[PDB]
Amino acid sequence: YYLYMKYVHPFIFSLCTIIPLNPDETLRKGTGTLCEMLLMVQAYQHNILLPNKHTDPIERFYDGHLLESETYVGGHVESLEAGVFRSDLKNEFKIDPSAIDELLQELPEALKFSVEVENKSSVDKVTNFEEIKNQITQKLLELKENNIRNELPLIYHVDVASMYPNIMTTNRLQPDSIKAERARKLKWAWRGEFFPSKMDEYNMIKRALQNETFPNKNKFSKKKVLTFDELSYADQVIHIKKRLTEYSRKVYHRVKVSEIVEREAIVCQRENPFYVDTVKSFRDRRYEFKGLAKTWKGNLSKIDPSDKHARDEAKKMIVLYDSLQLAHKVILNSFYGYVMRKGSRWYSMEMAGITCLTGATIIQMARALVERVGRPLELDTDGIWCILPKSFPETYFFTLENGKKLYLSYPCSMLNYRVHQKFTNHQYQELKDPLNYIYETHSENTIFFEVDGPYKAMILPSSKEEGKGIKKRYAVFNEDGSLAELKGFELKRRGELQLIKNFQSDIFKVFLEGDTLEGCYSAVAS
Amino acid sequence: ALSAQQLLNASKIDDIDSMMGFERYVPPQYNGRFDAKDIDQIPGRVGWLTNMHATLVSQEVTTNQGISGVDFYFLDEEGGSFKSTVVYDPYFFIACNDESRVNDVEELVKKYLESCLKSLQIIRKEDLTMDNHLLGLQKTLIKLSFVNSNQLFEARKLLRPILQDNADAKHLIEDIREYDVPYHVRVSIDKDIRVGKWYKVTQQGFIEDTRKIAFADPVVMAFDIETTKPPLKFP
């Protein structure tokens, strides 16, 4: 009862205030179906004919081979360095001066960029621009001089706030806008694990499958024995898959051939903008509900600080705004999950394959910039797990004329500056005039990074095979000793072993100790 | 056959919900206009919509069937509840190869589906697979009206060999649109009715009470059981 009320009662009804479904199928069905229903009401609102569901083809052809499955190159997972990296243990750095002297040229324009779009204000109200710029310059000049240093590294995690829908609002990626030579050009990566066999072998054993007998599907009629020609296509291709699997086990020495071919897509920006105003209305509504819930939190909890007053008439609206912003954030993550789901009205492998490769280039540019100024430890879909030195500049505050100290983080603003230089869509055309068809193009980039503070320690495990490590496993915690996030390690595993779960718990307990690397490792050994 | 069985099932659903405080609220005969903020001059009731369901309500010349609607379930501000339904006709679209050869397709569906149809209208909608559609080019479609969703499935089954043998008026139908969209989805999208919002149930539609941003007070019972079970097995 309390898990239902405090977690999913206003959440399911907050989702249901915009979704044209009952709450039983809002909770029971898939989240991509919910995104398809909201896309259907947005297509009905701006008069766009909704297409049919994606009736997939029975067979796709490539290089004379049949495609068993067709997808794109997904995410990248890498454990570059494992070990105990802490803020009370020292480590050696190999900082490259090329990124430091190339990064110090662009510094005051980066501070101008920070005060103009991260703070949404002007440069003239900022009075402490020059001294903050000079201490950042002196700190990186001392780090450019003594690039080989050994101190305690502080753990930084970057995160793109709603990465893939921000990618969709920058590049205007729609499933029904990608034209094929019939305009913004971008590059995606195809990936198919097809069969090594050719067309002639498939035709010969298909003729051999034509000379057999097969059972009947419907168990209510009077027909039990059927021939190959009266059969459907799904049973045919499932039988095709299994005999070509034993054919490639007998003729060839593998089952799937991995081949990645980079292709191109044409995105005509003069189309109907209902998809980008749909994802931007849900992102602006999440930010509006976040602002409404923060004003309601601060003002309505400080205006009535007595428990003798009726403050519980406002508790339903505070949990209503928290559930509405939670519903819009899971709708954005489900927009990315719904763009590559089978049987979708707005289906394209192209619209989802552009996003993960443009996000992989964003995270690879971030990984290379991190690689030239520090040590990356883990790379995943949303950010990079890295260690930067303690003498690197972290947080400063810009003072305005009105008295507001604006929040500034240096690697978050330098990564926002680098993504705005390399991934800004200047061809973002939109409807300036509906009657005279005048389109207006401008600059648009809503891809923003956010680093959330210094962490105490980070411990990553690795493999028992030479060449790589164990993917997606780490342990990070807050600076006050409590656990922040645990991904990959279960520590409460029910089914593996009880001993392994309590062993992981007291190994994390002994991990929170020591000022030497040998002492924390000997504590884990004891 | 399948027509009266769903009406008997909807009468059983009405007899089950008639003891749960969900009675059919009938709006009065209002001759007023269409407005949103005007709530003090319209005969209705402001209710909080909590559940909606695709049912088959009766007529109140047709055969032994009924007009398909959506049963709505509410929560009044006086600690009580009431239910209501709406009159609606389902539809789906049919694509076409030529904008001047649509007369052959309308005469073919007017003769081929004489007992299945209710009415007919031509709707122009935006198709994004069309070249130069942004300059003022739309796709002209055919919107068929029905009285039930069973009639929509019957019209789909009767139109099944034409689109499959196509890929004369028989060789003009290429593919159909909006056929697999559910009925409750169609009534919630076209009448702009979302569940969880406060609505004044009038005879002239479902206007939205956007003053009350808060929800109503429902009654939640979250049960959990314990049972006898065999040794080391599932019960």
Swiss-Prot record, chain A:
It is found in: Nucleus. Changing residue 163 to G: Increases rates of C-to-A transversion substitutions. Disulfide bonds: none annotated. Coiled coil: none annotated. Changing residue 163 to I: In POL2-9; temperature-sensitive mutant. Catalytic component of the DNA polymerase epsilon complex which participates in chromosomal DNA replication. Required during synthesis of the leading DNA strands at the replication fork, binds at/or near replication origins and moves along DNA with the replication fork. Has 3'-5' proofreading exonuclease activity that corrects errors arising during DNA replication. In eukaryotes there are five DNA polymerases: alpha, beta, gamma, delta, and epsilon which are responsible for different reactions of DNA synthesis. Belongs to the DNA polymerase type-B family. DNA polymerase epsilon is a heterotetramer consisting of POL2, DPB2, DPB3 and DPB4. The DNA polymerase activity domain resides in the N-terminal half of the protein, while the C-terminus is necessary for complexing subunits B and C. This is DNA polymerase epsilon catalytic subunit A. It comes from Saccharomyces cerevisiae (strain ATCC 204508 / S288c). The chain holds residues 482 to 1021 of 2222 of the full protein.
